[PDB]
Amino acid sequence: STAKVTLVTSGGSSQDFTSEQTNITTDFARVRVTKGMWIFYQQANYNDASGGGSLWIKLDESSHLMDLPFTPRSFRPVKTFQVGATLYKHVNFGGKELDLPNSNPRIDIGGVSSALISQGQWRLYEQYDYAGPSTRRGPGVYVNAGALGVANDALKSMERE
Ligand SMILES: [Ca+2]
Secondary structure (H helix, E strand, O other), X not given: OOOEEEEEOOOOOEEEEOOOEOOXXXXXXXXXXXXXXXXXXXXXXXXXXXXXXXXXEEEEOOOOOEEOOOOOOEEEEOOOXXXXXXXXXXXXXXXXXXXXXXXXXXXXOOOOOEEEEOOOOEEEXXXXXXXXXXXXXXXXXXXXXXXXXXXXXXXXXXXXX
């Protein structure tokens, strides 16, 4: 497995996950990310109903179990950890995601509103196919579009330098 997290219920029962969970029946209370980077959301489907405005938390690898801030209803790995960038439809990493290991000339996820850049330097464009003005962004956490240097819902292509 390339990403892995352990989750524990208030009653003491544990389960490990290695892939995205759009829904989860079990109520988990404590967490330890053992591989990769994960995002947890208060609502199912990665905070889609709230357009990213419900509670969320991004967690990195850890050596110990600790409390979650809320009971997750969905959670997923950031699959471009150590590879590239992931784009998200909603602020705060919510909604439909799109992984960019490399340049993408035509981004179409219903309007990009946040991003996690793990690796690379990139130029971000508000037209397809690297047309028009661009902004440069490297590794970082970008919880809204303004942080990326683009208008909300406007990112259309992203070139890796
Ligand atoms: Ca959006």
